[PDB]
Design an enzyme around this catalytic site. Structure first.
Site, mmCIF file in Angstrom:
data_model
loop_
_atom_site.group_PDB
_atom_site.id
_atom_site.type_symbol
_atom_site.label_atom_id
_atom_site.label_comp_id
_atom_site.label_asym_id
_atom_site.label_seq_id
_atom_site.Cartn_x
_atom_site.Cartn_y
_atom_site.Cartn_z
ATOM 1 N N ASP A 136 4.290 -1.283 -5.551
ATOM 2 C CA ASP A 136 2.993 -1.700 -5.055
ATOM 3 C C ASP A 136 2.959 -3.145 -4.566
ATOM 4 O O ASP A 136 2.902 -4.080 -5.366
ATOM 5 C CB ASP A 136 1.974 -1.488 -6.174
ATOM 6 C CG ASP A 136 0.558 -1.679 -5.718
ATOM 7 O OD1 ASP A 136 0.312 -1.608 -4.500
ATOM 8 O OD2 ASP A 136 -0.313 -1.885 -6.585
ATOM 9 N N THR A 137 2.996 -3.324 -3.248
ATOM 10 C CA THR A 137 2.960 -4.662 -2.671
ATOM 11 C C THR A 137 1.569 -5.272 -2.825
ATOM 12 O O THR A 137 1.411 -6.490 -2.794
ATOM 13 C CB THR A 137 3.337 -4.649 -1.173
ATOM 14 O OG1 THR A 137 2.451 -3.782 -0.457
ATOM 15 C CG2 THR A 137 4.766 -4.173 -0.987
ATOM 16 N N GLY A 138 0.563 -4.420 -2.994
ATOM 17 C CA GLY A 138 -0.793 -4.903 -3.160
ATOM 18 C C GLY A 138 -1.106 -5.261 -4.601
ATOM 19 O O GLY A 138 -2.265 -5.450 -4.960
#
Ligand code: RIT
Lengths: 99, 99
Positions: free
Chosen positions: A25-27
């Site tokens: 998850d880059t967010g």
């Protein structure tokens, strides 16, 4: 490896001798797991998402094996409907977005 | 673009004539935008994440311009502490995750 995004970016994890799947998850700034037992002291902490806040437990210096890579970092354990590996660990394995 | 993850992956967006900043989020299936004004009729949809669920408006076939790339897709509008570009739009610009 290269990961297309037509499917959820799931990777297999080995943490505290326990196997599980997590979402790259880059967010997410941090890593969080729903149900795993980790040894040692932890610090109460709260994180927020689109739904609201959440009380989690913070564990530092935890060796985690990401897709065959050995990394160490802070891991959060608390109520979450999905296991997430954040940027705090993704930078240790050289993850980059590309387009 | 190659973006590392030592910083939140933010990109500038032009949506409905409005300019916004959004987070490239591989951990999100849908694109979420906090308050912006969009055309036409929607459909009361609900999404969940950490903390819980939220009521949002679902707009279909809305054109978005990410880094000069224009794509049309479904955009959800609703209470959210951060604008998020999900996988539904990231596959449009051929965005991959590498490590
Ligand atoms: C059940 C499970 C198997 C799944 N459901 C889904 C489908 N759903 C609902 C989503 O993708 N929902 C998205 C979402 O919240 N994604 C989330 C991952 C997730 C997915 C499912 C359930 C719980 C968490 C991941 C997103 O990057 C958000 C973005 C963000 C950041 C700041 C403020 C608001 C939002 N991240 C967080 O809220 O991270 C919280 C943190 C954890 N550790 C540190 S911060 C919405 C934006 C659309 C995917 S996997």
């Amino acid at each position: 490896p290269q990961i297309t995004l037509w499917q959820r970016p799931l990777v297999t994890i080995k943490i505290g001798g326990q196997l599980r799947e997590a979402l790259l998850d880059t967010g997410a700034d941090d890593t969080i797991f729903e149900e795993i037992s980790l040894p040692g002291r932890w610090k109460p902490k709260m994180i927020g998402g689109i739904g609201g806040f959440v009380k989690v437990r913070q564990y530092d210096q935890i060796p985690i094996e990401i897709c065959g890579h050995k990394v160490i970092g802070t891991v959060l354990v608390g109520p979450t409907p999905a296991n997430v590996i954040g940027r705090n660990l993704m930078t240790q394995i050289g993850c980059t977005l590309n387009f």
